Amino acid sequence: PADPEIVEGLPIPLAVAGHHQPAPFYLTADMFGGLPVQLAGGELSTLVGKPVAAPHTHPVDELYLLVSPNKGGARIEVQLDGRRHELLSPAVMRIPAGSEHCFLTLEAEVGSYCFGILLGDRL
Numbered sequence: 001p002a003d004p005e006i007v008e009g010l011p012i013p014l015a016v017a018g019h020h021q022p023a024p025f026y027l028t029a030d031m032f033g034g035l036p037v038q039l040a041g042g043e044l045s046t047l048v049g050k051p052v053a054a055p056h057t058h059p060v061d062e063l064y065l066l067v068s069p070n071k072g073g074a075r076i077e078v079q080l081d082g083r084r085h086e087l088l089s090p091a092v093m094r095i096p097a098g099s100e101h102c103f104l105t106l107e108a109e110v111g112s113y114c115f116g117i118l119l120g121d122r123l
C-alpha cells in the first residue's frame with residue numbers, strides 16, 4: 001500500500017553547509033523520478049530569536065516564502081551579503097545564487113512558516 005505518487009516520509013533532514021542540525025526538506029531532487037527544484041523549511045513558532053544557520057551560499061537561486069495565519073503574524077530578518085533586510089508575512093524574497101545569506105525569526109505565531117525554494121537540483 002505505498003503509493004508511488006505520495007511521500008509521507010517527511011521531512012527529509014539533509015546536512016547543509018552553515019546549518020547546525022540537518023535542514024528539513026519537503027521536496028528533494030530525487031523525488032518522483034527527478035524534480036527541477038527543492039524545498040525546505042518549517043514552522044517557526046519555536047525559533048524566535050534562534051537562527052537555523054550561519055551565513056551560507058548555494059549554487060542556485062533560493063526564494064524565501066514567509067506565511068502566517070494572521071496578516072503580519074511573522075517577521076524575519078534576512079542578511080544578504082551583509083545587508084539586513086526584513087520581511088513581514090506574507091512575503092517572498094529572492095536570494096541570488098552565490099549570495100552569502102541567512103535568516104532570523106524576529107516574530108512568529110503558531111502556524112508561521114518559512115520555506116526556501118531552491119531553483120535547481122543541486123545544493
Ligand SMILES: N[C@@H](Cc1c[nH]c2ccccc12)C(=O)O
Pocket residue numbers: 023024040041042043044052062102103113114115116
Ligand atoms: N533552505 C533554507 C532553510 C529554511 C528556510 N526556512 C526555514 C524554516 C525553518 C528551518 C529552516 C528553514 C535556507 O537555505 O535558508
Ligand SMILES: [Zn+2]
Pocket residue numbers: 056057058062101116
Ligand atoms: Zn539558503
